[PDB]
Tab-separated table of N, CA, C and O and ligand atoms in Angstrom:
chain	number	residue	atom	x	y	z
A	1	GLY	N	10.695	-33.600	23.196
A	1	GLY	CA	9.760	-33.733	21.945
A	1	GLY	C	10.939	-33.857	21.052
A	1	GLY	O	11.866	-34.284	20.708
A	2	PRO	N	9.858	-34.348	19.924
A	2	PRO	CA	10.925	-34.153	18.371
A	2	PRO	C	11.631	-32.633	18.224
A	2	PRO	O	10.273	-31.997	18.407
A	3	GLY	N	12.052	-32.756	17.526
A	3	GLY	CA	12.634	-31.366	16.791
A	3	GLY	C	12.007	-31.744	16.198
A	3	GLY	O	11.631	-32.287	14.648
A	4	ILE	N	11.456	-29.639	16.148
A	4	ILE	CA	10.914	-29.491	15.288
A	4	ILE	C	11.766	-29.850	12.696
A	4	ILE	O	12.948	-29.669	13.191
A	5	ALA	N	10.492	-29.082	11.890
A	5	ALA	CA	10.988	-29.841	10.741
A	5	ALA	C	11.818	-28.238	10.100
A	5	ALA	O	11.488	-27.122	10.856
A	6	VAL	N	12.585	-28.253	9.712
A	6	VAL	CA	13.228	-27.219	9.354
A	6	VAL	C	13.172	-27.587	7.433
A	6	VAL	O	14.115	-28.299	7.024
A	7	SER	N	12.285	-26.529	7.027
A	7	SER	CA	12.824	-26.849	5.417
A	7	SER	C	13.039	-27.068	4.849
A	7	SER	O	14.267	-25.819	5.417
A	8	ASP	N	13.699	-27.554	3.371
A	8	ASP	CA	14.748	-26.884	3.442
A	8	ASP	C	15.254	-26.022	2.662
A	8	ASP	O	16.387	-25.196	2.039
A	9	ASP	N	14.002	-24.951	2.116
A	9	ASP	CA	13.925	-23.794	1.413
A	9	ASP	C	14.399	-22.946	2.434
A	9	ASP	O	15.556	-21.447	2.548
A	10	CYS	N	14.652	-22.629	3.895
A	10	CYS	CA	15.606	-21.930	4.524
A	10	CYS	C	17.095	-22.608	4.792
A	10	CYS	O	17.621	-20.591	4.109
A	11	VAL	N	17.483	-23.663	4.100
A	11	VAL	CA	19.104	-23.572	3.992
A	11	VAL	C	19.140	-22.599	2.981
A	11	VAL	O	20.239	-22.390	2.741
A	12	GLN	N	18.684	-23.417	1.625
A	12	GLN	CA	18.610	-22.902	0.581
A	12	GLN	C	18.828	-20.933	0.349
A	12	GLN	O	19.158	-20.313	-0.526
A	13	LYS	N	17.645	-21.024	1.030
A	13	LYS	CA	17.579	-19.329	1.173
A	13	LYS	C	18.914	-18.511	1.785
A	13	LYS	O	18.716	-18.040	1.715
A	14	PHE	N	19.239	-19.429	2.879
A	14	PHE	CA	20.075	-18.943	3.594
A	14	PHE	C	21.548	-18.934	2.591
A	14	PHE	O	22.615	-18.208	2.770
A	15	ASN	N	22.088	-19.975	1.926
A	15	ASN	CA	23.375	-20.234	1.470
A	15	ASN	C	23.050	-19.254	0.194
A	15	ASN	O	24.433	-18.619	0.264
A	16	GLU	N	22.101	-18.660	-0.237
A	16	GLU	CA	21.881	-17.793	-1.239
A	16	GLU	C	22.230	-16.747	-0.550
A	16	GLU	O	23.136	-15.365	-1.347
A	17	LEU	N	22.147	-16.135	-0.046
A	17	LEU	CA	23.028	-14.668	1.609
A	17	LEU	C	24.195	-15.260	1.658
A	17	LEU	O	25.708	-13.944	1.007
A	18	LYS	N	24.799	-16.391	2.289
A	18	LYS	CA	25.848	-16.304	2.594
A	18	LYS	C	26.702	-16.740	1.436
A	18	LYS	O	28.654	-16.039	1.563
A	19	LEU	N	26.609	-17.426	0.331
A	19	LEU	CA	27.849	-17.501	-0.707
A	19	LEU	C	27.662	-16.331	-2.214
A	19	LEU	O	28.351	-15.537	-2.454
A	20	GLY	N	26.095	-16.217	-1.933
A	20	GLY	CA	25.896	-15.389	-3.191
A	20	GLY	C	25.705	-14.068	-3.370
A	20	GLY	O	25.533	-13.359	-4.000
A	21	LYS	N	25.549	-13.293	-2.070
A	21	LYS	CA	25.328	-11.895	-1.449
A	21	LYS	C	24.594	-11.234	-2.733
A	21	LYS	O	24.267	-10.309	-2.825
A	22	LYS	N	23.210	-12.472	-2.427
A	22	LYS	CA	22.010	-12.527	-3.293
A	22	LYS	C	21.156	-11.934	-2.751
A	22	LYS	O	19.697	-11.451	-3.344
A	23	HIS	N	20.769	-12.113	-1.584
A	23	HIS	CA	19.536	-11.789	-0.282
A	23	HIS	C	20.035	-11.135	0.861
A	23	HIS	O	21.265	-11.747	1.784
A	24	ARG	N	19.797	-9.741	0.957
A	24	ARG	CA	20.479	-8.872	2.391
A	24	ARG	C	20.003	-9.377	3.546
A	24	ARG	O	20.851	-9.612	4.637
A	25	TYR	N	18.898	-10.162	3.397
A	25	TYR	CA	18.416	-11.002	4.529
A	25	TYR	C	17.075	-12.097	3.865
A	25	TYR	O	16.538	-11.769	3.551
A	26	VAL	N	16.963	-12.699	5.560
A	26	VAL	CA	15.936	-13.713	5.156
A	26	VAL	C	15.233	-13.662	6.475
A	26	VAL	O	15.607	-13.704	8.288
A	27	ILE	N	13.950	-14.016	6.917
A	27	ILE	CA	13.055	-13.484	8.068
A	27	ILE	C	12.150	-15.229	7.500
A	27	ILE	O	11.649	-15.728	7.030
A	28	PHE	N	12.525	-15.995	8.629
A	28	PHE	CA	11.651	-17.333	8.761
A	28	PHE	C	10.605	-17.315	10.081
A	28	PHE	O	10.862	-16.299	11.238
A	29	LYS	N	10.191	-18.345	9.497
A	29	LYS	CA	8.316	-18.195	10.743
A	29	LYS	C	8.210	-19.690	11.155
A	29	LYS	O	8.680	-20.782	10.568
A	30	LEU	N	7.579	-20.217	12.204
A	30	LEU	CA	7.004	-21.159	12.768
A	30	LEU	C	5.865	-21.754	11.765
A	30	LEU	O	5.042	-20.772	11.478
A	31	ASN	N	5.476	-21.987	10.816
A	31	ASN	CA	4.237	-22.303	10.076
A	31	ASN	C	3.320	-22.389	11.285
A	31	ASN	O	3.828	-22.591	12.861
A	32	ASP	N	1.874	-22.457	11.375
A	32	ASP	CA	0.121	-22.947	11.724
A	32	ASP	C	0.775	-23.800	12.636
A	32	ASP	O	0.190	-23.446	13.829
A	33	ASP	N	0.997	-24.794	11.774
A	33	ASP	CA	0.426	-26.094	13.639
A	33	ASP	C	2.132	-26.283	13.502
A	33	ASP	O	2.075	-27.051	15.073
A	34	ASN	N	3.182	-24.485	14.050
A	34	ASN	CA	4.501	-25.399	14.827
A	34	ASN	C	5.175	-26.724	14.529
A	34	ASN	O	5.615	-27.261	15.978
A	35	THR	N	5.261	-26.909	13.430
A	35	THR	CA	5.803	-28.278	13.289
A	35	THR	C	7.011	-28.211	12.162
A	35	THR	O	7.984	-28.703	12.217
A	36	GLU	N	7.380	-26.993	11.976
A	36	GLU	CA	8.144	-26.972	10.615
A	36	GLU	C	8.205	-25.113	10.175
A	36	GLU	O	8.046	-24.493	10.652
A	37	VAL	N	9.480	-25.340	10.324
A	37	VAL	CA	10.102	-23.880	10.286
A	37	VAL	C	9.983	-23.267	8.457
A	37	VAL	O	10.991	-24.027	7.884
A	38	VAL	N	10.202	-22.176	8.167
A	38	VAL	CA	9.622	-21.704	6.667
A	38	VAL	C	10.405	-20.274	6.582
A	38	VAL	O	10.034	-19.558	7.528
A	39	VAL	N	10.093	-20.286	5.448
A	39	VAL	CA	10.518	-18.627	5.134
A	39	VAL	C	9.810	-18.328	4.860
A	39	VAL	O	8.632	-18.608	3.927
A	40	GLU	N	9.600	-16.860	5.646
A	40	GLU	CA	9.039	-16.326	5.144
A	40	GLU	C	8.824	-14.883	4.982
A	40	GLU	O	7.703	-14.605	3.832
A	41	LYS	N	9.736	-14.011	4.696
A	41	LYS	CA	10.127	-13.228	3.583
A	41	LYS	C	12.159	-12.885	3.562
A	41	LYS	O	12.417	-13.618	4.072
A	42	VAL	N	12.427	-12.384	1.937
A	42	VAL	CA	13.752	-12.150	1.528
A	42	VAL	C	13.759	-10.724	1.604
A	42	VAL	O	12.537	-10.291	0.341
A	43	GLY	N	14.352	-10.255	1.909
A	43	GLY	CA	15.142	-9.355	1.161
A	43	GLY	C	15.896	-9.125	-0.197
A	43	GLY	O	17.011	-9.689	-0.668
A	44	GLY	N	16.023	-7.849	-1.321
A	44	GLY	CA	16.900	-7.499	-2.231
A	44	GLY	C	18.282	-6.967	-1.940
A	44	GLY	O	18.968	-6.978	-0.483
A	45	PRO	N	19.249	-7.660	-2.944
A	45	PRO	CA	19.997	-8.115	-2.066
A	45	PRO	C	21.170	-6.725	-1.844
A	45	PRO	O	21.615	-6.551	-0.774
A	46	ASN	N	20.330	-5.640	-1.791
A	46	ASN	CA	20.315	-4.274	-1.223
A	46	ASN	C	19.582	-3.376	-1.040
A	46	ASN	O	19.524	-2.181	0.088
A	47	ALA	N	18.931	-4.708	-0.046
A	47	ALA	CA	17.736	-3.883	1.126
A	47	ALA	C	18.298	-3.385	2.192
A	47	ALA	O	20.222	-3.220	2.358
A	48	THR	N	18.020	-2.490	3.262
A	48	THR	CA	18.690	-1.351	3.901
A	48	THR	C	17.683	-2.296	5.607
A	48	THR	O	17.177	-3.207	5.012
A	49	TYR	N	19.161	-1.861	6.391
A	49	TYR	CA	18.303	-2.553	7.868
A	49	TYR	C	16.757	-2.172	8.413
A	49	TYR	O	16.140	-2.862	8.997
A	50	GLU	N	16.830	-0.979	8.005
A	50	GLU	CA	15.031	-0.756	8.021
A	50	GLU	C	13.795	-1.189	7.123
A	50	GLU	O	12.851	-1.160	7.333
A	51	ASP	N	14.483	-1.293	5.828
A	51	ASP	CA	13.598	-2.339	4.752
A	51	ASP	C	13.696	-3.595	5.994
A	51	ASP	O	12.202	-4.363	5.724
A	52	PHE	N	14.130	-4.077	6.912
A	52	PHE	CA	14.012	-5.442	7.231
A	52	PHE	C	12.960	-4.804	8.397
A	52	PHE	O	12.126	-5.616	8.252
A	53	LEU	N	13.145	-4.025	9.210
A	53	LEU	CA	12.901	-3.437	10.372
A	53	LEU	C	11.005	-3.488	9.591
A	53	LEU	O	10.375	-3.764	10.440
A	54	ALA	N	11.015	-3.145	8.515
A	54	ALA	CA	9.406	-3.369	8.284
A	54	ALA	C	9.119	-4.035	7.997
A	54	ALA	O	7.482	-4.342	8.087
A	55	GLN	N	9.572	-5.197	8.207
A	55	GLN	CA	9.314	-6.511	7.828
A	55	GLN	C	8.444	-7.430	9.459
A	55	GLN	O	7.597	-8.007	9.380
A	56	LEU	N	9.368	-6.941	10.083
A	56	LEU	CA	8.622	-7.348	11.343
A	56	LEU	C	7.500	-7.873	12.414
A	56	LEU	O	7.298	-6.403	12.474
A	57	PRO	N	7.132	-8.528	12.358
A	57	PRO	CA	5.555	-7.861	13.635
A	57	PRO	C	5.882	-7.926	14.774
A	57	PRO	O	6.921	-7.664	15.538
A	58	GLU	N	4.826	-6.953	15.133
A	58	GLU	CA	5.316	-5.994	16.616
A	58	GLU	C	5.216	-7.155	17.519
A	58	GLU	O	5.417	-6.695	18.647
A	59	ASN	N	4.125	-8.249	17.886
A	59	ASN	CA	3.283	-8.766	17.917
A	59	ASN	C	3.412	-10.625	17.789
A	59	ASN	O	2.289	-11.626	18.330
A	60	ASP	N	4.461	-10.758	17.267
A	60	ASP	CA	4.737	-12.341	16.513
A	60	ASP	C	6.209	-12.305	16.590
A	60	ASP	O	6.857	-11.195	16.084
A	61	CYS	N	6.805	-13.600	16.546
A	61	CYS	CA	8.021	-13.696	16.766
A	61	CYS	C	8.710	-13.997	15.458
A	61	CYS	O	7.963	-14.482	14.739
A	62	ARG	N	10.191	-13.695	15.571
A	62	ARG	CA	10.268	-13.742	14.014
A	62	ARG	C	11.683	-14.697	14.324
A	62	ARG	O	12.435	-14.450	15.038
A	63	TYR	N	12.466	-15.468	13.298
A	63	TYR	CA	14.038	-15.635	13.145
A	63	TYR	C	14.229	-15.083	11.840
A	63	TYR	O	13.618	-15.362	11.003
A	64	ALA	N	15.261	-13.974	12.263
A	64	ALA	CA	15.744	-13.757	10.595
A	64	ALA	C	17.599	-13.538	10.879
A	64	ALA	O	18.707	-14.031	11.521
A	65	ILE	N	18.057	-14.105	9.987
A	65	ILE	CA	19.530	-13.616	9.086
A	65	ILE	C	19.395	-12.805	8.117
A	65	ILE	O	19.374	-11.874	7.534
A	66	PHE	N	20.257	-12.044	9.070
A	66	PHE	CA	21.240	-10.789	8.089
A	66	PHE	C	22.415	-10.119	7.650
A	66	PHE	O	23.358	-10.639	8.525
A	67	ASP	N	23.075	-10.196	6.893
A	67	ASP	CA	24.299	-9.998	6.172
A	67	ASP	C	24.883	-8.872	6.205
A	67	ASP	O	24.040	-7.963	5.536
A	68	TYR	N	24.976	-7.975	7.705
A	68	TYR	CA	25.609	-6.712	7.893
A	68	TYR	C	26.445	-6.732	7.576
A	68	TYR	O	27.359	-6.776	7.670
A	69	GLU	N	26.770	-5.097	6.749
A	69	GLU	CA	27.653	-4.813	6.514
A	69	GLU	C	28.124	-3.257	7.203
A	69	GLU	O	27.723	-2.539	7.496
A	70	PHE	N	29.162	-3.527	7.646
A	70	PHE	CA	30.221	-2.046	8.427
A	70	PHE	C	30.932	-1.192	7.336
A	70	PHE	O	30.887	-1.914	6.484
A	71	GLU	N	30.642	-0.179	7.906
A	71	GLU	CA	31.133	1.423	7.569
A	71	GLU	C	32.284	0.897	7.001
A	71	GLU	O	33.329	-0.175	7.799
A	72	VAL	N	33.032	1.137	5.376
A	72	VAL	CA	34.138	1.119	4.812
A	72	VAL	C	34.914	1.489	6.169
A	72	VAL	O	34.957	3.039	6.120
A	73	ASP	N	36.763	0.743	6.918
A	73	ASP	CA	37.074	1.165	7.318
A	73	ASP	C	38.151	0.704	6.191
A	73	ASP	O	38.516	-0.744	7.345
A	74	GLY	N	39.373	0.909	6.545
A	74	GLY	CA	40.729	-0.265	6.042
A	74	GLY	C	39.319	-1.772	5.219
A	74	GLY	O	39.917	-2.771	5.623
A	75	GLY	N	38.384	-1.190	3.645
A	75	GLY	CA	37.908	-2.671	3.471
A	75	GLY	C	36.909	-2.768	3.830
A	75	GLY	O	36.695	-1.685	5.115
A	76	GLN	N	35.871	-3.881	3.823
A	76	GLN	CA	34.775	-3.553	4.219
A	76	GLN	C	34.022	-4.786	4.588
A	76	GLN	O	34.394	-5.781	3.744
A	77	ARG	N	34.598	-4.779	6.159
A	77	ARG	CA	34.005	-6.337	6.685
A	77	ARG	C	32.460	-6.459	6.173
A	77	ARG	O	31.569	-5.949	6.675
A	78	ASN	N	31.819	-8.175	6.502
A	78	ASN	CA	30.410	-8.550	7.374
A	78	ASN	C	30.168	-9.263	8.799
A	78	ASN	O	31.224	-9.495	8.468
A	79	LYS	N	29.421	-9.287	8.786
A	79	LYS	CA	28.690	-10.378	9.797
A	79	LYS	C	27.389	-11.093	9.331
A	79	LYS	O	26.622	-9.863	9.058
A	80	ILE	N	27.504	-12.370	9.608
A	80	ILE	CA	26.820	-13.048	9.334
A	80	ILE	C	25.614	-12.995	10.574
A	80	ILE	O	25.967	-14.019	12.138
A	81	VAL	N	24.498	-12.048	11.148
A	81	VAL	CA	23.505	-12.476	12.080
A	81	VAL	C	22.494	-12.781	12.698
A	81	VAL	O	21.715	-12.795	11.697
A	82	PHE	N	22.533	-14.045	12.990
A	82	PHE	CA	21.271	-14.587	13.623
A	82	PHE	C	20.185	-13.955	14.341
A	82	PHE	O	21.017	-13.259	15.345
A	83	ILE	N	19.170	-13.553	14.473
A	83	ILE	CA	18.391	-12.803	15.033
A	83	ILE	C	17.214	-13.529	15.828
A	83	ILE	O	16.414	-14.318	14.782
A	84	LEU	N	17.132	-13.597	16.706
A	84	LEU	CA	15.549	-13.885	17.248
A	84	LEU	C	15.167	-12.747	17.710
A	84	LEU	O	15.565	-11.980	18.610
A	85	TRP	N	13.683	-12.369	17.297
A	85	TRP	CA	12.911	-11.627	17.131
A	85	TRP	C	12.191	-11.685	18.254
A	85	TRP	O	11.418	-12.637	18.189
A	86	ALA	N	11.580	-11.579	19.613
A	86	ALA	CA	10.639	-11.684	20.630
A	86	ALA	C	10.047	-10.845	21.070
A	86	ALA	O	10.833	-10.467	22.177
A	87	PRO	N	8.991	-9.976	20.492
A	87	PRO	CA	8.467	-9.108	20.816
A	87	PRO	C	8.074	-9.029	22.654
A	87	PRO	O	7.350	-10.470	22.385
A	88	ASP	N	7.777	-8.200	23.813
A	88	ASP	CA	7.176	-8.405	24.604
A	88	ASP	C	5.787	-9.266	24.219
A	88	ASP	O	5.385	-9.704	25.284
A	89	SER	N	5.195	-8.324	23.465
A	89	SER	CA	3.481	-8.211	23.080
A	89	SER	C	3.134	-9.820	22.526
A	89	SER	O	2.396	-10.075	22.589
A	90	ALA	N	4.011	-10.890	21.802
A	90	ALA	CA	3.818	-11.408	21.655
A	90	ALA	C	3.186	-12.562	22.567
A	90	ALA	O	3.838	-12.435	23.364
A	91	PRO	N	1.973	-13.101	22.210
A	91	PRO	CA	2.256	-14.066	22.957
A	91	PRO	C	2.763	-15.095	23.596
A	91	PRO	O	3.252	-15.613	23.051
A	92	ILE	N	2.867	-15.530	25.495
A	92	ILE	CA	3.551	-16.316	26.013
A	92	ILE	C	4.178	-17.212	25.060
A	92	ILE	O	5.242	-18.597	25.028
A	93	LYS	N	2.975	-17.891	24.203
A	93	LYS	CA	3.141	-19.565	23.493
A	93	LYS	C	4.163	-19.299	22.479
A	93	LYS	O	4.616	-20.685	21.843
A	94	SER	N	4.086	-17.867	21.518
A	94	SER	CA	4.675	-17.438	20.392
A	94	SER	C	5.705	-18.016	20.810
A	94	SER	O	7.098	-18.668	20.309
A	95	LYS	N	6.624	-17.028	21.815
A	95	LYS	CA	7.278	-17.072	22.613
A	95	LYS	C	8.256	-17.460	22.915
A	95	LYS	O	9.405	-18.489	22.841
A	96	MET	N	7.119	-18.893	24.180
A	96	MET	CA	8.281	-20.626	24.023
A	96	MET	C	8.761	-21.365	22.990
A	96	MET	O	9.544	-22.033	23.036
A	97	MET	N	7.422	-20.724	21.980
A	97	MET	CA	7.687	-22.022	20.508
A	97	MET	C	8.245	-21.648	19.973
A	97	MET	O	9.842	-22.763	19.441
A	98	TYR	N	9.423	-20.363	20.386
A	98	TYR	CA	10.409	-20.127	19.008
A	98	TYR	C	11.958	-20.535	20.294
A	98	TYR	O	13.372	-20.666	18.807
A	99	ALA	N	11.310	-20.037	20.771
A	99	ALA	CA	12.605	-20.226	21.971
A	99	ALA	C	13.335	-21.775	22.004
A	99	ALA	O	14.376	-21.952	21.884
A	100	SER	N	11.741	-22.989	22.221
A	100	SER	CA	12.062	-24.254	21.630
A	100	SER	C	13.165	-24.861	20.380
A	100	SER	O	13.794	-25.358	20.896
A	101	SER	N	12.281	-23.893	19.331
A	101	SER	CA	12.709	-23.994	18.256
A	101	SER	C	14.587	-23.448	17.648
A	101	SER	O	14.406	-23.625	16.595
A	102	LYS	N	14.707	-22.452	18.095
A	102	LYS	CA	15.767	-21.628	17.923
A	102	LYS	C	17.202	-22.575	17.698
A	102	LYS	O	17.548	-22.266	16.322
A	103	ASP	N	17.678	-23.457	18.490
A	103	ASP	CA	18.623	-24.777	17.939
A	103	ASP	C	18.498	-25.565	17.273
A	103	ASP	O	19.440	-25.253	15.765
A	104	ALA	N	16.900	-25.854	16.701
A	104	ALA	CA	16.905	-26.402	15.704
A	104	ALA	C	16.971	-25.021	14.341
A	104	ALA	O	18.163	-26.075	13.473
A	105	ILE	N	16.995	-24.382	14.072
A	105	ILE	CA	17.100	-24.142	13.175
A	105	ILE	C	18.806	-23.461	13.346
A	105	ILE	O	19.021	-23.418	12.203
A	106	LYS	N	19.723	-22.475	13.800
A	106	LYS	CA	20.927	-22.125	14.158
A	106	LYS	C	21.739	-23.649	13.571
A	106	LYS	O	22.222	-23.301	12.705
A	107	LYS	N	20.815	-24.484	13.796
A	107	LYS	CA	21.590	-25.694	13.891
A	107	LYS	C	22.026	-25.964	12.565
A	107	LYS	O	22.434	-26.589	11.340
A	108	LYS	N	20.926	-25.432	11.288
A	108	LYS	CA	20.783	-25.653	10.451
A	108	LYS	C	21.703	-24.680	8.960
A	108	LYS	O	21.615	-25.065	8.021
A	109	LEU	N	21.921	-24.045	9.521
A	109	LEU	CA	22.556	-22.599	9.298
A	109	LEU	C	24.082	-22.880	9.298
A	109	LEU	O	24.769	-22.406	10.323
A	110	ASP	N	24.686	-23.292	8.245
A	110	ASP	CA	26.430	-23.461	8.342
A	110	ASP	C	27.431	-22.195	8.120
A	110	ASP	O	27.169	-20.720	6.695
A	111	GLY	N	27.410	-21.234	9.170
A	111	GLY	CA	28.013	-19.718	8.657
A	111	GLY	C	27.287	-18.603	9.349
A	111	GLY	O	27.853	-17.605	9.667
A	112	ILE	N	26.348	-18.924	10.672
A	112	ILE	CA	26.175	-17.845	11.740
A	112	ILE	C	27.413	-17.906	12.290
A	112	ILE	O	28.085	-18.223	13.161
A	113	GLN	N	27.687	-15.831	12.754
A	113	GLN	CA	29.040	-15.082	12.962
A	113	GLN	C	28.577	-14.696	14.214
A	113	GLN	O	29.434	-14.407	15.617
A	114	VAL	N	26.953	-14.292	14.280
A	114	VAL	CA	26.933	-13.438	15.285
A	114	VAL	C	25.048	-13.432	15.415
A	114	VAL	O	24.497	-14.160	14.290
A	115	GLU	N	25.064	-13.741	17.299
A	115	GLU	CA	23.629	-14.008	17.354
A	115	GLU	C	22.864	-13.298	18.054
A	115	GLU	O	23.531	-12.191	19.318
A	116	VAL	N	21.784	-12.647	18.030
A	116	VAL	CA	20.999	-11.192	18.866
A	116	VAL	C	19.939	-12.065	19.288
A	116	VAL	O	19.318	-11.923	18.419
A	117	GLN	N	19.522	-11.544	20.077
A	117	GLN	CA	17.834	-12.157	20.545
A	117	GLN	C	17.494	-10.250	21.542
A	117	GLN	O	17.944	-9.532	22.199
A	118	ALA	N	16.046	-9.719	20.571
A	118	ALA	CA	15.814	-8.480	20.637
A	118	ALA	C	14.238	-8.171	20.885
A	118	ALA	O	13.830	-9.401	20.257
A	119	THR	N	14.406	-8.428	22.055
A	119	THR	CA	12.281	-7.407	22.402
A	119	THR	C	12.218	-6.519	22.654
A	119	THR	O	10.704	-6.767	22.288
A	120	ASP	N	12.738	-5.716	22.098
A	120	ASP	CA	12.029	-4.175	22.004
A	120	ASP	C	12.933	-3.314	20.793
A	120	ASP	O	13.223	-3.649	20.362
A	121	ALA	N	11.962	-2.516	20.481
A	121	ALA	CA	12.769	-1.335	19.355
A	121	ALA	C	14.319	-1.571	19.530
A	121	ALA	O	14.883	-0.291	18.621
A	122	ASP	N	15.128	-0.991	20.729
A	122	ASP	CA	16.096	-0.499	21.133
A	122	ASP	C	17.467	-1.671	20.827
A	122	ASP	O	17.931	-1.698	20.098
A	123	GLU	N	16.840	-3.242	21.266
A	123	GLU	CA	17.529	-4.034	21.685
A	123	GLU	C	17.776	-4.707	19.678
A	123	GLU	O	19.110	-5.379	19.224
A	124	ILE	N	16.394	-4.102	18.893
A	124	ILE	CA	16.434	-4.623	17.736
A	124	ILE	C	17.558	-3.628	17.016
A	124	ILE	O	17.808	-3.934	15.155
A	125	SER	N	17.590	-1.968	17.134
A	125	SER	CA	17.479	-1.368	16.321
A	125	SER	C	19.577	-1.061	15.578
A	125	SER	O	19.956	-1.871	16.406
A	126	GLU	N	19.235	0.014	14.572
A	126	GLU	CA	20.382	-0.866	13.884
A	126	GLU	C	22.076	-0.686	14.823
A	126	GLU	O	23.085	-1.585	14.625
A	127	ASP	N	22.068	0.041	15.797
A	127	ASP	CA	23.312	0.424	16.774
A	127	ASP	C	23.610	-0.406	17.098
A	127	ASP	O	24.237	-0.576	17.306
A	128	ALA	N	21.811	-1.098	17.811
A	128	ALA	CA	22.383	-2.563	19.170
A	128	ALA	C	23.035	-3.210	18.314
A	128	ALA	O	24.313	-4.259	18.870
A	129	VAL	N	22.571	-3.605	17.408
A	129	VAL	CA	22.883	-4.884	16.241
A	129	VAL	C	24.602	-4.793	16.212
A	129	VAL	O	24.999	-5.655	15.717
A	130	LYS	N	24.165	-3.583	15.376
A	130	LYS	CA	26.554	-2.901	14.880
A	130	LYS	C	26.974	-3.362	16.267
A	130	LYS	O	28.508	-4.456	15.793
A	131	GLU	N	26.455	-2.960	17.024
A	131	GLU	CA	28.263	-3.198	18.637
A	131	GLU	C	27.822	-4.407	18.444
A	131	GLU	O	29.059	-4.880	18.818
A	132	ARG	N	26.497	-5.240	18.725
A	132	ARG	CA	26.542	-6.715	19.317
A	132	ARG	C	27.931	-7.032	17.965
A	132	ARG	O	28.857	-8.064	18.461
A	133	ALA	N	27.493	-7.168	16.733
A	133	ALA	CA	28.779	-8.031	15.707
A	133	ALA	C	29.473	-7.274	15.438
A	133	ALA	O	30.763	-8.302	15.839
A	134	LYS	N	30.279	-6.047	15.614
A	134	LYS	CA	31.427	-5.512	16.058
A	134	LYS	C	32.658	-5.583	17.190
A	134	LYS	O	33.324	-6.453	16.459
A	135	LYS	N	31.706	-6.856	17.857
A	135	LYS	CA	31.744	-7.020	19.313
A	135	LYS	C	32.733	-8.654	18.853
A	135	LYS	O	32.336	-9.562	19.873
B	1	LIG	NI1	12.049	-33.239	22.710
B	2	LIG	NI1	17.105	-15.943	-4.397
């Protein structure tokens, strides 16, 4: 089938994060008709990882970009982390729709450095993402 559309807002907000460090994170979702990827929520420049986690639905999928900052250790390194949040409680149709569209949204974001697929509270936890991003 045709590739899903990706709103220009997705790229616009991603570049604000990647370039301006204006937003700590961006959460994207498939619109109601599953015809376009759109921005749902953005975090402030200083939002925390726990702030981000509190935005994730327990029973639906999301895409997200998190500008992950590691602990200071000879300077402060960061990693642009792309996350597919696919909780097991999500309906199978949702899980399959977000799987099908993942490439499309990734292809539109210039500068992803790390990719995480998380399905439960442990795989989305900061410790798990940190280790995957350190890596
Ligand atoms: Ni196709
Ligand atoms: Ni903004």
